[PDB]
Amino acid sequence: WQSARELLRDWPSQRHLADRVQPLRMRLSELEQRLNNQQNAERLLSEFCK
Amino acid sequence: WQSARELLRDWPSQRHLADRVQPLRMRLSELEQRLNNQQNAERLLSEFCK
Amino acid sequence: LIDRVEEVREEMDEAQEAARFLQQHGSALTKLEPMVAVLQSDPQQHEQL
């Protein structure tokens, strides 16, 4: 009974957090471009400074 | 009975998403600063076009 | 042209209202959850039952 109650308490949260996938895909794509530009700037800085 | 069940269905979701206010605050701060930079670049682009 | 600052602000409104409602009725909801089943049985209806 307690495990069934705990499972039915988890189910609401499981659905709401599973819905977070698409918003995070756009965040991942944007953050990936940011890292690319950080590495381009660091590389270009290092080559010019050399 | 049905209204109590519906409340006990919604309340766990309310508790689960209430903690996201701070993650949303930092998300909106970065996103609005990004939109200011987008607006600045659009203005400077449109200014140079002519 | 993402314009998602409005969506994030709607998520904040819903989340701040959820937090405000949690502060307003958390004690009532926690006292209701251990004996919700009683609501299916009303004193006069128990005789008709």
mmCIF file of C-alpha atoms in Angstrom, chain A:
data_model
loop_
_atom_site.group_PDB
_atom_site.id
_atom_site.type_symbol
_atom_site.label_atom_id
_atom_site.label_comp_id
_atom_site.label_asym_id
_atom_site.label_seq_id
_atom_site.Cartn_x
_atom_site.Cartn_y
_atom_site.Cartn_z
ATOM 1 C CA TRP A 1 0.000 0.000 0.000
ATOM 2 C CA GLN A 2 2.735 2.527 0.974
ATOM 3 C CA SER A 3 4.793 1.667 -2.148
ATOM 4 C CA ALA A 4 1.640 1.995 -4.365
ATOM 5 C CA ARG A 5 0.948 5.432 -2.712
ATOM 6 C CA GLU A 6 4.620 6.477 -3.221
ATOM 7 C CA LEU A 7 4.480 5.293 -6.896
ATOM 8 C CA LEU A 8 1.240 7.266 -7.525
ATOM 9 C CA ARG A 9 3.000 10.289 -5.842
ATOM 10 C CA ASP A 10 6.008 9.842 -8.221
ATOM 11 C CA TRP A 11 3.804 9.495 -11.389
ATOM 12 C CA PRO A 12 2.752 13.266 -11.412
ATOM 13 C CA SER A 13 6.433 14.348 -11.075
ATOM 14 C CA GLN A 14 7.651 11.729 -13.650
ATOM 15 C CA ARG A 15 5.272 13.169 -16.330
ATOM 16 C CA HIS A 16 6.082 16.849 -15.540
ATOM 17 C CA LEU A 17 9.879 16.240 -15.652
ATOM 18 C CA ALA A 18 9.551 14.029 -18.820
ATOM 19 C CA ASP A 19 7.831 17.088 -20.475
ATOM 20 C CA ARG A 20 11.133 19.081 -19.876
ATOM 21 C CA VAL A 21 12.916 17.271 -22.837
ATOM 22 C CA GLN A 22 12.052 19.637 -25.778
ATOM 23 C CA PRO A 23 12.904 22.932 -23.881
ATOM 24 C CA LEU A 24 16.308 21.345 -22.989
ATOM 25 C CA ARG A 25 17.021 20.333 -26.678
ATOM 26 C CA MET A 26 16.960 24.012 -27.756
ATOM 27 C CA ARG A 27 19.081 24.910 -24.653
ATOM 28 C CA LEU A 28 21.612 22.162 -25.601
ATOM 29 C CA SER A 29 21.827 23.377 -29.243
ATOM 30 C CA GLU A 30 22.420 27.004 -28.135
ATOM 31 C CA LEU A 31 24.946 26.058 -25.379
ATOM 32 C CA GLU A 32 26.829 23.830 -27.908
ATOM 33 C CA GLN A 33 27.269 26.823 -30.277
ATOM 34 C CA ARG A 34 28.498 28.911 -27.280
ATOM 35 C CA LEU A 35 31.219 26.321 -26.479
ATOM 36 C CA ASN A 36 32.213 26.234 -30.193
ATOM 37 C CA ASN A 37 32.635 30.048 -30.212
ATOM 38 C CA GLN A 38 34.534 29.947 -26.864
ATOM 39 C CA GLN A 39 37.000 27.410 -28.357
ATOM 40 C CA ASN A 40 37.286 29.447 -31.623
ATOM 41 C CA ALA A 41 38.076 32.633 -29.616
ATOM 42 C CA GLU A 42 40.585 30.792 -27.313
ATOM 43 C CA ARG A 43 42.334 29.176 -30.354
ATOM 44 C CA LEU A 44 42.493 32.452 -32.351
ATOM 45 C CA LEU A 45 43.781 34.274 -29.203
ATOM 46 C CA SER A 46 46.503 31.615 -28.658
ATOM 47 C CA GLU A 47 47.637 31.604 -32.343
ATOM 48 C CA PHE A 48 47.792 35.439 -32.548
ATOM 49 C CA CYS A 49 49.505 35.694 -29.112
ATOM 50 C CA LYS A 50 52.135 33.174 -30.453
#
